Design a binder for these strands. Structure first.
Lengths: 83, 77, 80, 66, 122
RNA sequence: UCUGAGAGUUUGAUCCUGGCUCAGGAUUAACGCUGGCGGCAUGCCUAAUACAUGCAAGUCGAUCGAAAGUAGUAAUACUUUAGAGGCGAACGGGUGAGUAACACGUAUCCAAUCUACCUUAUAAUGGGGGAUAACUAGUUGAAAGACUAGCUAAUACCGCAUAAGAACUUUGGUUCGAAUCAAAGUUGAAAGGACCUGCAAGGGUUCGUUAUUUGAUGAGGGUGCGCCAUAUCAGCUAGUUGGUGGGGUAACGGCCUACCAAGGCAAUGACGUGUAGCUAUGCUGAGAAGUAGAAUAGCCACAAUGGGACUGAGACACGGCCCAUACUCCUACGGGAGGCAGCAGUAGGGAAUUUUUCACAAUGAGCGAAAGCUUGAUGGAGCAAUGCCGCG
């Protein structure tokens, strides 16, 4: 049962609902027209898996799984420490 | 027009009458289950669900799920 | 038959039961020029073994060129 | 089909108001009992339909009544 | 029993919604209209899908009325609406689906195309 | 190997920038001028406008009744299928209108999937029951037909018994919110063809029956990514956002319901308007790239219009149903019948596109053991210089 997991690193934007947090990611990628790397922005809502606490003011990794509810398919995996 | 379609049109109508008869039979059995819980009626409804998932009338996955829920709620004892 | 009109051509295509012609296929067996019949064609000789491994019985009409090839001689061990 | 001894091609000619509509229509009423005409067994007791002479003559445009 | 200069409804697919009587056909000073009496009307308001305009004078027979009248049977029939069936100086309409209840005391005066196209005859 | 040609135009003459035009091709191009032919491909871009006839899907008599008929004294040899039941009819066709997106294409997790007919191999095929199509009698009718009664066949369907393996549950061993392992609480499957052999009773060949696992095939969901324009579209949205309980669901999910909580997105262009089937690709250019989305292919989506449902693995279904809308047609005026964006074809529009054509010969799909059958799929010929190409 070796699963392949997709992990995305992001910075948490806010925590508005209980065990539900918004995390922001910015990715710099080549724009296919003018050869300059543009920065795109994504926001993603996630929930507490039950063993880690994603708090505002830290960088986290988010991993894919079954859809738990609307707009959420991702569990908080691991917060990597501050500066 | 078409001829075998009419044969197929009347063919499954009797099939559907019989199948809905047994489906509402299962419905009243699980309703008796809803009224009050026992081992015997749960076994009877499982035996009926075995036939119904055995035929194409009822999906096997749905029957497995419902029987899992029923055993989960009866194992509260 | 495809290709130039009045010049028949018939690629040996792959289909399990319900793939219409000129579409998706799992593997290309090879080609065939059905104008001069000598079974002159390039094949993998293993892709047919691929069908023989998991079913999807081959088309009943291309069977003769494989008889010339002799696929039974390497197929009789399917049920032993 | 069968011998031509029984098949017979006839014709009706009459002056106008010498019985074009009357002769033709009522003969069709008497004889036209089969799906080729079939007019009588669909219009025996219906309201009498005397279409306009121009309209009746354009609607009944035909060359074969067998 | 239809009042002079009065609006009414329609009972078939004609694109008409609210039409008003203008003059009633018949003898001079009849002053009342019974079932089957075709009348000159004028459309007050309707949806634009109709084949005629609003306000323009047009020609339609009446089908429904709450008053009714005693038919020869001896038992009286009533309604609760006043409706019309729109015709073209004949016994046939332009409409393809007739709606609502239609009486029977009109066959003697014609309009036999209405009864066959009627979903149900009362 | 790949790598870009100029010319003209404001001025008394003369220079900058700058537009415009030509020399190049390419088209699903009309129409002149017309014109010999061979192949070679193409031939509603336009009203998703409505439409006659033939074709567009049938098949199983080796599963059966049942009547009928050629030859038969009789038994019936044989025929044939209106019918039940079996499979398929959702695959195949064309359209591209609405769709601005998880439609498409790519990479993906499906620890949330399912897939009859095949795949390796396993488990069995015991019997029991009664309706009913068809047929017959009648009411109602030209037909339509409905409503009763009698007559049955079957792999149709409903119990009994029996379970290898399965589900369901409990204990015991496992992995970076799950999986495998021994034991057991619960429970359930059916049928007969065709032939051989055997006095028989059995046994065997093979279809199929019912079950299991490898698979693959097929469909579906999420995910990141890229995939129109518009600021004379500034804020927009409230099952909306979150979880719980319960329900539904091949299956995860406000998918749905109850309880409350209060957001969610946004100037990094949301929301709204025009507009578009998408993509691969076609054309052009030295390239970067720009135009278009012809034929052909893959995905999605539609199917006179809008909804709702059953069928079976599989559909909300060009020619399966119900209703409404709109239209047409028949009629005995009682009442019904019908769906060319299937092929041809018509009517109109339109400058602008054909055959009211042929063989299922090969191949594809469905049925069948097979005779083979069905196929406007497929392939031909018709018309057209419409384009490339040869040739008088």
């Amino acid at each position: 049962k070796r699963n392949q997991r997709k992990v995305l690193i992001g910075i948490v934007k806010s925590t508005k609902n209980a065990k539900t947090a918004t995390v922001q990611v910015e990715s710099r990628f080549k724009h296919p027209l003018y050869h300059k790397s543009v920065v795109r922005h994504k926001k993603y809502q996630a929930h507490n898996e039950g063993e880690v606490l994603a708090k505002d003011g830290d960088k986290v990794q988010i991993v894919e799984t079954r859809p738990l509810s609307a707009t959420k398919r991702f569990r908080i995996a691991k917060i990597i420490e501050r500066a | 027009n078409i001829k075998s379609n009419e044969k197929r049109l009347r063919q499954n109508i009797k099939r559907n009458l019989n199948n809905k008869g047994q489906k509402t039979k299962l419905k009243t059995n699980v309703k008796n289950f809803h009224k009050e819980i026992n081992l015997d009626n749960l076994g009877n409804v499982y035996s009926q669900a075995d036939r119904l998932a055995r035929k194409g009338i009822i999906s096997t996955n749905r029957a497995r799920r419902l029987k899992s829920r029923n055993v989960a709620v009866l194992n509260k004892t | 038959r495809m290709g130039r009109v009045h010049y028949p051509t018939y690629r040996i295509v792959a289909v399990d039961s319900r793939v219409k012609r000129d579409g998706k296929y799992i593997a290309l067996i090879g080609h065939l020029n059905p104008a001069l019949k000598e079974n002159k064609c390039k094949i993998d000789e293993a892709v047919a073994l691929e069908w023989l491994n998991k079913g999807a019985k081959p088309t009943d009409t291309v069977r003769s060129l494989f008889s010339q090839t002799g696929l039974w001689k390497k197929f009789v061990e399917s049920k032993k | 089909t069968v011998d031509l001894i029984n098949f017979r091609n006839f014709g009706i000619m009459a002056h106008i108001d010498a019985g074009k509509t009357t002769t033709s229509e009522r003969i069709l009423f008497h004889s036209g009992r089969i799906h080729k005409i079939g007019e009588t067994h669909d219009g025996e007791s219906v309201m009498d339909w005397m279409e306009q002479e121009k309209e009746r003559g354009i609607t009944i445009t035909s060359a074969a009544t067998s | 029993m239809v009042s002079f200069m009065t609006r009414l409804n329609v009972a078939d697919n004609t694109g008409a919604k609210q039409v008003g009587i203008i003059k009633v056909l018949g003898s001079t000073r009849k002053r009342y209209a019974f079932l089957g009496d075709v009348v000159v009307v004028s459309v007050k308001d309707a949806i634009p899908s109709g084949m005629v305009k609003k306000g323009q004078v047009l020609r339609a027979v009446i089908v429904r009325t709450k008053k009714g009248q005693q038919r020869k049977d001896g038992t009286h029939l009533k309604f609760d609406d006043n409706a019309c069936v729109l015709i073209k100086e004949d016994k046939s309409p332009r409409g393809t689906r007739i709606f609502g209840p239609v009486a029977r005391e009109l066959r003697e005066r014609g309009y036999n195309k209405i009864l066959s196209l009627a979903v149900e005859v009362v």
